[PDB]
Amino acid sequence: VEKVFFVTSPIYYVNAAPHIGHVYSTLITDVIGRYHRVKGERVFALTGTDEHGQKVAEAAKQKQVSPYDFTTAVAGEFKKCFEQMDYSIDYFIRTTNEQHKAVVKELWTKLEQKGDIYLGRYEGWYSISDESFLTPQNITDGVDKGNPCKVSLESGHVVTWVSEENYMFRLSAFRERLLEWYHANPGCIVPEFRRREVIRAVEKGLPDLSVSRARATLHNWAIPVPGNPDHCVYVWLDALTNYLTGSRLRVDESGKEVSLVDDFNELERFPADVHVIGKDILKFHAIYWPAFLLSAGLPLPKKIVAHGWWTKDRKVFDPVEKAEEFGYDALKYFLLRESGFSDDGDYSDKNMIARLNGELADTLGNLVMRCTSAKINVNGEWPSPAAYTEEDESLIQLIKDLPGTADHYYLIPDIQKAIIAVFDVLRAINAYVTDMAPWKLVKTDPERLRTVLYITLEGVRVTTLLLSPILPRKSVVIFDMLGVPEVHRKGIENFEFGAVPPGTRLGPAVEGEVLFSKRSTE
Numbered sequence: 001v002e003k004v005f006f007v008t009s010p011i012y013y014v015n016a017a018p019h020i021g022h023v024y025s026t027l028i029t030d031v032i033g034r035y036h037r038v039k040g041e042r043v044f045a046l047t048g049t050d051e052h053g054q055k056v057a058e059a060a061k062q063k064q065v066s067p068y069d070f071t072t073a074v075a076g077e078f079k080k081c082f083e084q085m086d087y088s089i090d091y092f093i094r095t096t097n098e099q100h101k102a103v104v105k106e107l108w109t110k111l112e113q114k115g116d117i118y119l120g121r122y123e124g125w126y127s128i129s130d131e132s133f134l135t136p137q138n139i140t141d142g143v144d145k146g147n148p149c150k151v152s153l154e155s156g157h158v159v160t161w162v163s164e165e166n167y168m169f170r171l172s173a174f175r176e177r178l179l180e181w182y183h184a185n186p187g188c189i190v191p192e193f194r195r196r197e198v199i200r201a202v203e204k205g206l207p208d209l210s211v212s213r214a215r216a217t218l219h220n221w222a223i224p225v226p227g228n229p230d231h232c233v234y235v236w237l238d239a240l241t242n243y244l245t246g247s248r249l250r251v252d253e254s255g256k257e258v259s260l261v262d263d264f265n266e267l268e269r270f271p272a273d274v275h276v277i278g279k280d281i282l283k284f285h286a287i288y289w290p291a292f293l294l295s296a297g298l299p300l301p302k303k304i305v306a307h308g309w310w311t312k313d314r315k316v317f318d319p320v321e322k323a324e325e326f327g328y329d330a331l332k333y334f335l336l337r338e339s340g341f342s343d344d345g346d347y348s349d350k351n352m353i354a355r356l357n358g359e360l361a362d363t364l365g366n367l368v369m370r371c372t373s374a375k376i377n378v379n380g381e382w383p384s385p386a387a388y389t390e391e392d393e394s395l396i397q398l399i400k401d402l403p404g405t406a407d408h409y410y411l412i413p414d415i416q417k418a419i420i421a422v423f424d425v426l427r428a429i430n431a432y433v434t435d436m437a438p439w440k441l442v443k444t445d446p447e448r449l450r451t452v453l454y455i456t457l458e459g460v461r462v463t464t465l466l467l468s469p470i471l472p473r474k475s476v477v478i479f480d481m482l483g484v485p486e487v488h489r490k491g492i493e494n495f496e497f498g499a500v501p502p503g504t505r506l507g508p509a510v511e512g513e514v515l516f517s518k519r520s521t522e
């Protein structure tokens with residue numbers, strides 16, 4: 001099936017201004033999207049805001065502002081933040097959007113009509129801040145901001161008791177089918193240890209899920225249950241549905257939603273190929289969402305990838321401050337290189353300088369300038385290579401192999417491993433150049449310099465191609481410099497070694513340009 005490659009971020013609670021971590025979550029989505037476009041696929045990257053609910057209403061109340069004006073305000077800050085971050089996101093969805101509301105009601109009725117919703121009670125614990133139901137096994141003693149109280153073991157936020165007559169979803173009726181799913185498709189959750197988590201959790205057992213709430217308790221800031229106005233639809237069913245809505249909106253060039261199609265198939269987007277989420281919101285995506293879709297008879301997503309950060313809680317680092325100080329591409333690169341799947345990373349100013357200088361400036365930067373220098377490349381062109389020594393071939397072989405391995409990494413997706421894979425190959429090219437001493441060759445042996453300079457150029461191109469989803473602005477400056485024609489800057493075709501042919505002319509130089517400039521160690 002050729003289809004639109006559909007990738008998502010989570011949609012974020014608008015309770016507080018956007019910080020790092022939304023930025024991280026959405027950057028991953030952006031990168032995954034960007035890569036598939038570099039492959040020449042159709043993409044649809046979605047992101048947005050989660051605007052309804054108790055959490056969000058009570059933040060609006062605590063600021064003495066109306067929910068309508070509050071959400072709109074904060075949503076605008078999220079849009080400004082993401083514009084400023086220079087993502088290539090295809091659409092920004094809001095759950096207040098009337099077309100979304102329409103899809104939630106539509107979905108609820110599917111779920112209702114299958115007989116997977118019934119009127120019951122939920123008498124148990126709830127984290128308003130997580131908008132999560134919790135069994136007593138996942139609460140414990142702690143402090144309110146300072147009295148003694150019970151808190152979520154998930155997040156350490158304050159939980160409270162809840163005894164409401166609610167509409168209930170038959171999640172228990174879906175235990176075995178989730179379990180078949182998980183096993184049948186072992187790629188479906190990334191990273192592997194969270195897949196194991198999700199299975200152990202569901203093995204142990206699933207109770208039914210309370211998919212409505214008394215309207216009094218939600219401050220009437222939510223979507224009403226179809227055919228029962230005394231209730232509102234659980235904020236997470238509302239939130240998760242953003243993906244299905246997203247998959248059905250027609251969007252103009254300006255980024256404005258213009259139409260909601262009846263059948264998701266019409267746009268060939270649903271289901272999501274990859275859902276980017278933080279580890280704090282796994283259950284909702286890996287248990288609830290599949291159960292809802294299986295009820296509605298909808299297709300399940302292909303991949304849920306849950307990165308190592310929290311999606312929401314501010315537990316100092318301002319992206320825009322750091323982006324101005326170090327660079328937008330540098331910051332994105334640093335965040336992506338440093339953060340693994342279980343997050344044990346160093347985000348100190350010292351480390352950011354070490355990597356910017358070490359990797360981007362010394363390994364990539366230097367190398368780009370060597371092969372384009374007037375000193376070495378005296379014709380500002382791609383020379384035609386002579387015969388290859390077994391060293392020459394050793395590196396060519398690395399450069400040939402890099403797209404295959406970088407691709408697989410991107411498809412996991414483990415963007416960090418992908419970056420390493422490339423930079424390994426960059427460090428090889430430096431090593432190569434150190435040996436050959438191209439500076440010495442331009443006098444000694446011009447015939448050899450051709451072979452050397454050609455391989456350098458083509459490695460630096462192919463590495464920069466595979467780096468392009470991470471360093472989107474700089475890859476354009478690298479290609480401009482190497483004089484790579486615009487057609488050769490994307491497509492699986494141009495992952496092949498030698499796509500840009502000899503006798504191509506390098507880009508014009510500038511009197512004081514440097515690609516990445518070192519920052520003092522202080």
Ligand code: MET
Nearest residue numbers: 010011012013050239240
């Ligand atoms: C359907 S994703 C919803 C995520 C939630 N709004 C959060 O910020 O964590």
